[PDB]
Amino acid sequence: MKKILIVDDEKPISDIIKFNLAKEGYDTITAFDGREALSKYEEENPDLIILDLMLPELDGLEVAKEVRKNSHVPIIMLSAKDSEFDKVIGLEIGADDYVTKPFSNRELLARVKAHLRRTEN
Amino acid sequence: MKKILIVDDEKPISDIIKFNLAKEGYDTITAFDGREALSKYEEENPDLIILDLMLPELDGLEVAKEVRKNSHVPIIMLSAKDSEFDKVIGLEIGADDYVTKPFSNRELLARVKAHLRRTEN
């Protein structure tokens, strides 16, 4: 199975993503801070990271940069900041996608599927 | 350089995307209906397709379906339909991204870069 790393500080959001991804047959691991995200990414090799922008310790931009030091694993950024600026900055840093909260669970699921399917190709 | 196929029946929209992509160093080719899109996609081999959903002759889902028979070339779908349903359908058929109209040009550009950058990896 494909393993999704879900990093978000707010546990109710993380549980909804985890539950929906589990329904679809994904393995899921969670991190609730930027530092925890980076250690979980190195130790467990997720196939995709869902990455909140506002995290403890290290924010999502910083996490994304460290990941991109070493890998091309797809990154879908989540953000309450729905500015045009923030979306461009996330993508240029190395996000493969940028989704604002509130978001649709099905849309995120299909975005997860779409980016995992590219990795195959 | 990279070649972007821009398929939108509405020439003002197409011109703004052509202009912004050309400014960023991209080569650009255009189509204005689904049939013309498929012939240009076949004969000119774009590195990325920006694909309007509301097309005459055949709509963007059909274009995407046809293209996907033979290539994994990235497709960024554009749509005035801002519904969760239409976003998921486009992604499931094989769109790599789905962006609603009206859109930010820097954001679309950033998404163009992000999906071309994935192909290079």
Author numbering:
A (entry chain A), B (entry chain B): 1 to 121
Quote the passages of the study that discuss this structure, keeping the authors' original sentences:
VicR is a response regulator, which plays an important role in S. mutans growth and biofilm formation. Along with its cognate histidine kinase VicK, it constitutes the VicRK TCS that is involved in regulation of cell wall metabolism, nutrient uptake, osmotic protection, and biofilm formation. A typical TCS consists of a sensor histidine kinase and a response regulator, where the histidine kinase senses an environmental signal and relays the signal to a cognate response regulator, which in turn modulates expression of a cascade of effector genes.
Western blotting revealed that VicR-N and not VicR-C was captured by the biotinylated 2-AI (lanes 4 and 8), suggesting that the N terminus binds to this reverse amide 2-AI. We obtained diffractable crystals and determined the crystal structure of VicR-N using molecular replacement. VicR-N forms a dimer in the asymmetric unit. We also identified an unmodelled density surrounded by four negatively charged amino acids (Asp8, Asp9, Asp52, and Glu10) within the experimental structural map. To further investigate the binding, we docked 2B5 to VicR-N using AUTODOCK 4 and determined a binding energy of −4.98 kcal/mol. In the docking model, 2B5 is close to Asp9 (2.5 Å), Asp52 (2.6 Å), and Glu 10 (2.9 Å) of VicR-N, three of the negatively charged amino acids surrounding the undefined density shown in the experimental structure map. Further, we have demonstrated that the lead reverse amide 2-AI binds to the N-terminal signal receiver domain of VicR. This binding may inhibit the formation of the active VicR homodimer, which occurs at the N-terminal domain.
